[PDB]
Design an enzyme around this catalytic site. Structure first.
Site, PDB file in Angstrom:
ATOM      1  CD  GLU C 358     -23.448 -11.663 -63.359  1.00 49.86           C
ATOM      2  OE1 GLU C 358     -23.490 -12.251 -62.262  1.00 49.86           O
ATOM      3  OE2 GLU C 358     -24.345 -10.885 -63.752  1.00 49.86           O
ATOM      4  CG  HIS C 488     -38.174  -5.684 -60.774  1.00 48.18           C
ATOM      5  ND1 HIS C 488     -38.000  -5.647 -62.141  1.00 48.18           N
ATOM      6  CD2 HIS C 488     -36.942  -5.866 -60.241  1.00 48.18           C
ATOM      7  CE1 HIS C 488     -36.721  -5.813 -62.423  1.00 48.18           C
ATOM      8  NE2 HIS C 488     -36.058  -5.949 -61.289  1.00 48.18           N
TER       9      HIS C 488
END
Ligand SMILES: CC(=O)N[C@@H]1[C@@H](O)[C@H](O)[C@@H](CO)O[C@H]1O
Ligand SMILES: *[C@@H]1O[C@H](CO)[C@@H](O)[C@H](O)[C@H]1NC(C)=O
Ligand SMILES: *[C@@H]1O[C@H](CO)[C@@H](O)[C@H](O)[C@H]1NC(C)=O
Ligand SMILES: *[C@@H]1O[C@H](CO)[C@@H](O)[C@H](O)[C@H]1NC(C)=O
Ligand SMILES: *[C@@H]1O[C@H](CO)[C@@H](O)[C@H](O)[C@H]1NC(C)=O
Lengths: 598, 196, 598, 194
Positions: C358, C488
């Site tokens: 991240e 998705h």
């Protein structure tokens, strides 16, 4: 030498002998869908309906040759008029295409809607299964409020444009039907213009109903004033002593029925209530017994017993999982002697009364089956369910039940029991009359154009405040669509059946009861074992819509008009007691109380 | 003592439609009328002529049996002097009638799901039927001033219409089978006997 | 002297200094909901976003006056290309409303979907908490199959109508932007029009990806052959040596990731599988320590340390009872110099890796801020997560952990441990590449019109059998819509990002290690303490999307194309070992084996 | 003269002017020790282009000008001779030849508020670059193209001054910095500001 009359009779003869069976097939396919729901059966039902629909229109175009004026007398005259008014071929094809999508869109929107908790988005509720239980049962002010506002907001806002389009297209459709305004078209059903100059006019219906409302307003006003005092105890700081009630608190989603406010406002709690459900269950009573007792009741007055076709053929019990079914009770007049009742019956008091009511529908259909095909639709929109409510009223009385064996003879029927009984009755019966009238007058007015688009909601609530004494908990602007929230509004259904639906039961009960020489109070009337009442009733039923409904009514009650005198007489004991209790409390509304404006 | 062959008429698995009613002549048999009444399965078995018990002894010149299929409501028309669409336009018994009429419910075999439209009747005619007259004309009927171009059209209706029989229909609309016996005496010696 | 270029520079100048703040207000308002979930904060987020959207549309419409053709050098014409493209002038309003209703509906159905045990109807599980747990951890063939089939059946069947309408409308919407089909629109991210002849085309991406699949098939086929042999032991009678694997058995709901099959298929089930969670806890490591060490690593390579705003404002720890939040890790670039990380950190090994991953997003985030606003998206669809995962690779190596102090220095790194590491990584990294490629191939074909609607399912599974070697446990007719079952697909997200991300991940990793002058196997490379590698990385990271992505790629890895050579080189040790282990068993698959076909 | 220089009134001023309307607070016979300002050493940026503050022991001058304004952190680099950007070209321009000190410190705590403090303004577009110590407060709408601006914002008519967006959460660069610029002038007229 065949006069155009004489020819028309021949044409109708051909129509009757061809159309009876074809209509039968559409009825059977629809029945199969409801008792065996599947997509294939849906397709079959729609296909058969399409056959009947195209045939009916072809018969309409053939029917137009014989013109009403040359026609002489008199049901054949009437038959042709029903035939000529095709039904839907007036709106441009493109406009028809938009209209059907709009109609189905609103129907699905109403059925598909679900509402979430504000802080709990995952928790979701539907109205028909879940919100109904919340609205009827709750005592909590805030929960009820959130459900009401959410439902009217979330579903309504999506509908507030589609209703605007629906109004214009339906208005054009009616204007094309030479029925100005469309609200006017709905009131078509009552009017019997061909009464030799003295015919009912459709504009006259509004005048009659308005007179009815002023005549009924004293009972409604006193009933409400009593209720608001009773409600005030439960929600201490949320109801105003002189103000109209908030919409949510009335006992269901819109306030149509106040029966669910009976526990809150019960006058005499300790006195024992009347339920024979357990006595029914404990006695080994099955649904077959319920309907057999029902048929026996109709046998007593002199009406015929059920057909063999009726018993073997109807769906009286939920099959289980031979199939899935629509659980709603429906009475079928399929066609050539197929008279069926469809119910997911349970051995309860509610279903006993409802069964007795539905069999009345069948008895009407059976009695007037002799008349020509097109004249078999009751006498007006309000005659049918009215007749049913009459039969339910006679049976529900305690006197009948003691003879039945469902109630111990040793039930003491005093001042208190009957007044209380009449109050529950008033919440259901009298409570809905101003709501129904107001809702309709709103629809009729909007169709007239008397209300501009941008004031819809404003005017709606004004009427609700003035006419019904129900107030909005939160202000609603002009993107929400509250009137559509009711099922009958969202799916184009005429709502005036319910207002007149009442004005009938009693006017009819009073008579039938008077004919049976019942010596006593009106609400205790039981007409069982009175053939004479059966014969007067039989004479009315057999006519159907052959005669103008004014005359058919006159033969029973010696009058040609809607009279609420009998309704008020039914409720007069409760009426006097209500006046006694309301002496020390305010009676009447102030049009502008709002909970939010402190 | 050639026992009459009624069984074939009454027990027959195919009956013709009402307008095309079959006359099955019965000659030179001994005929037991007791068996018809003591079978006692029939919905309608009234002799308007003489009592069936009393006619066993009587011997007849010739006996004709008429059979057809009609609606339950229409059964009441199969009698002398009765009038309706069946009696006026299909099969009309004489005012001076002296015979038995037998009918029974046909729902089991004469109605099938979806409709047995194979049974036909005459809906329109220029003039009412004479007694025991059979009209199988397929000629188009002109209700109004305009004539039959020989083709179905406006105010030119086809005389025959299909009975729509279905199992679920009401008792009245249920198809019923009818058998009519007719009895005649003539100057020539009578031979259609019973147990004299 | 007022040329259109100069005027355009003024317009973008105004836009940059105006839009930067409004985007900030939308980003901060968005942050508030994610860190303090409530209805009120949701409404604030929608409102602020609404202002941003309206402003954006006004500036884009206005941007159309300055035309790209007259524009010369050089980011400004790219900025204009992004801006002039405006999202929404392009679909009919009715279709926009209908389409968005469809899109939201699919998301709710997927998120709200639940499946019941056949034994007990009311006991139901949702994918996110429970079905993922069952599919990820369970070993039972029938339980796993029941979850797989129930989810694909119950959720899929509901989704199929929505997907068909969704496809039609989405293609029409895509064509309004003058893109051939919806797949073409998604492709458009890769498109490079800044080269005079060497531009990347929208058709070319498929050819590159397809070629990559062929290059990858040897390693995947060997991984598959090994996995099915290991699976046969666990599931004795349901796996065929010549047949493809069943869909449920791969370790998750659709088979996207094989990472959870590591216990089933570990090469040396005796050697320890390195976890430092316990060691991290024992040394008193707090979440703050995880992030401080991560910052240290990026500092070591030469990148700048974190802003003060990062420390004070970000959510690095689960808030507790004071707030309520979704824990999914996110890297936030609010803008105006405000970079935050939102993570519910736990003292575990995975969260240490995730923190570095991240934080890489943030390092890119700080790097491209210098260039104009519209050129801060990043250089490609896959560049961002490629950077993050690349950083994770260096850290996961045992050498880095040994320097950390989490592992005793003489802990042994033999061939077996390394093979174990490469197997675990291969299941995650290589396993997903054909699932992803095949998926996007199916969607792209459908959008193209290459797949008829009536043959959707049949073709889909064929490809799954042919391209991925996964076989359906139960025949699925055309009412099922299995592709939508993946999150998705249901929520309209481009799925090819992950496929390109892996290729740019090892591509970058190899280049940076080569600059770090690390001589050894590729996976042991740790880029720590290497300024040169950091500086090359910095040169690329700052560019963002100002340049065409090919050129930036060429500066990093001395090539302009997607190359899996680095990916295959990384896994070469496991590849060779795979060949050794496979050659006593069948490698490949016969496509027409199905469990239902006995 | 023992009188001390009001620097305190300038530097500690609760309210500061926006960059385009930089307040020049004239120094009038306001003898102060320059040592104590660097000795305070709370400042983010204290670069003197000219001579050392330490070397200012015995130098007294005709007039000393103090300019105070507020700008973004990134823009501090522009507040130097020969630097170019939006600020130096269009708002406040130091001379190429500078013999003065430039002082700046972080102002985020007092100049930015939750929800946004848009009160500080800068001039975004101008016809030509500013000369040293030139100040333009024109509110004239900017003519991007040939077409004439009617004083109403529109296509190729953009308003020259635009509002600074300062918020607490912003980055160090976008955090407001307060600036104080000193200038020293010596003339043939008698020197009075020591
Ligand atoms: C990750 C890594 O190995 N970093 C390095 C560190 O271990 C070493 O102590 C330092 C000395 O210069 O460099
Ligand atoms: C219900 O519908 C199915 C549809 O194929 C049919 O097979 C079945 O016979 C129907 N049930 C009845 C009782 O007709
Ligand atoms: C039912 O009606 C029929 C009419 O045919 C009658 O014969 C019968 O007696 C009735 N049953 C009862 C219980 O009255
Ligand atoms: C029809 O068959 C039954 C069955 O045995 C028989 O008893 C009867 O006599 C038959 N009918 C006639 C008219 O003979
Ligand atoms: C969290 O949301 C509530 C909603 O009323 C709000 O009052 C509170 O200020 C929010 N917390 C923060 C830190 O903004």
């Amino acid at each position: 030498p065949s006069t155009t009359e004489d020819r028309a009779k021949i044409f109708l003869d051909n129509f009757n002998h061809e159309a009876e069976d074809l209509s039968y097939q559409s009825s059977l396919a629809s029945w199969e869908y409801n008792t065996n729901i599947s997509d294939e059966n849906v397709q079959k039902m729609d296909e058969a309906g399409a056959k009947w629909s195209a045939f009916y229109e072809e018969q309409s175009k053939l029917a137009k040759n014989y013109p009403l004026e040359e026609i002489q007398t008199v049901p054949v005259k009437l038959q042709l008029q029903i035939l000529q008014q095709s039904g839907s071929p007036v709106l441009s094809e493109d406009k028809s295409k938009r209209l059907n999508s709009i109609l189905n869109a609103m129907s699905t929107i109403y059925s598909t809607g679900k509402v979430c908790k504000p802080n709990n988005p995952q928790e979701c509720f539907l109205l028909e299964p879940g919100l109904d239980n919340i609205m009827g049962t709750s005592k909590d002010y805030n929960e009820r409020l959130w459900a009401w506002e959410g439902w009217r907001a979330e579903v309504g806002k999506q509908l507030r444009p589609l209703y605007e389009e629906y109004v214009a297209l339906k208005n054009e459709m009616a204007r094309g039907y030479h029925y100005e305004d469309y609200g006017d078209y709905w009131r078509r059903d009552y009017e019997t213009e061909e009464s030799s100059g003295s015919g009912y006019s459709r504009d006259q219906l509004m005048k009659d109903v308005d007179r009815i409302f002023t005549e009924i307003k004293p009972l409604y006003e006193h009933l409400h004033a009593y209720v608001r005092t009773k409600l005030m105890d439960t929600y201490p700081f949320h109801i105003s002593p002189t103000g109209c009630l908030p919409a949510h608190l009335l006992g269901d989603m819109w306030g149509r029925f106040w029966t669910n406010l009976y526990p809150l406002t019960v006058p005499f709690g300790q006195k024992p209530n009347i339920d024979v459900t357990d006595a029914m269950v404990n006695q080994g009573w099955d649904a077959n017994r319920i309907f057999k007792e029902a048929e026996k009741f109709f046998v007593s007055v002199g009406l015929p017993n059920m057909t063999e076709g009726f018993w073997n053929n109807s769906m009286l019990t939920e099959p289980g999982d031979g199939r899935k079914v629509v659980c709603h009770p429906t009475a079928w007049d399929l066609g050539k002697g197929d008279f069926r009742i469809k119910m997911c019956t349970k051995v309860t008091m509610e279903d006993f009364l409802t069964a007795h009511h539905e069999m009345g529908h069948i008895q009407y259909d059976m009695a007037y089956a002799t008349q020509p095909y097109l004249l078999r639709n009751g006498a007006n929109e309000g005659f049918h369910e009215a007749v049913g409510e009459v039969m339910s009223l006679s049976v529900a009385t305690p006197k009948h039940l003691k003879t039945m064996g469902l109630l111990s003879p040793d039930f003491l029927e005093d001042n208190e029991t009957e007044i209380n009984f009449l109050l529950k009755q008033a919440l259901n019966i009298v409570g809905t009359l101003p709501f129904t009238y107001m809702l309709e007058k709103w629809r009729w007015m909007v169709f007239r154009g008397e209300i501009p688009k941008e004031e819809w909601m404003k005017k709606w609530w004004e009427m609700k405040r003035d006419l019904v004494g129900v107030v909005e908990p939160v202000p609603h602007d002009e993107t929400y669509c509250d009137p559509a929230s009711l099922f009958h509004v969202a799916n184009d259904y005429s709502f005036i059946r319910y207002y007149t639906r009442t004005i009938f039961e009693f006017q009819f009960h009073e008579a039938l009861c008077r004919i049976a020489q019942h010596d006593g109070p009106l609400h205790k009337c039981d007409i069982s074992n009175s053939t004479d009442a059966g014969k007067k009733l039989h004479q009315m039923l057999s006519v159907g819509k052959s005669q103008p409904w004014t005359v058919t009514l006159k033969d029973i009650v010696d009058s040609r008009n809607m009279d609420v005198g009998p309704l008020l007489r039914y409720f007069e004991p409760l009426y006097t007691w209500l006046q006694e209790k309301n002496r020390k409390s305010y009676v009447g509304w102030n049009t502008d109380w709002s909970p939010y404006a402190d | 003592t050639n026992l009459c062959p009624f069984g074939e008429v009454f027990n027959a698995t195919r009956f013709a439609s009402v307008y095309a009613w079959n006359r099955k002549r019965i000659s030179n048999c001994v005929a037991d009328y007791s068996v018809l009444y003591n079978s006692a399965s029939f919905s309608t078995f009234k002799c308007y002529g003489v009592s069936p018990t009393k006619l066993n002894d009587l011997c007849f010149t010739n006996v004709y049996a008429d059979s057809f299929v009609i609606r339950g409501d229409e059964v009441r028309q199969i009698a002398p002097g009765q009038t309706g669409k069946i009696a006026d336009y299909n099969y009309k018994l004489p005012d001076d009638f002296t015979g038995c009429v037998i009918a029974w419910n046909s729902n089991n075999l004469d109605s099938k799901v979806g409709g047995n439209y194979n049974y036909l009747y005459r809906l329109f005619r220029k003039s009412n039927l004479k007694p025991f007259e059979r009209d199988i004309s397929t000629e188009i009927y002109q209700a109004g001033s305009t004539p039959c171009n020989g083709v179905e059209g406006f105010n030119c209706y086809f005389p025959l219409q299909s009975y729509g029989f279905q199992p679920t229909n009401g008792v009245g609309y249920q198809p019923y089978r009818v058998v009519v016996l007719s009895f005649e005496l003539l100057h020539a010696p009578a031979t259609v006997c019973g147990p004299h």
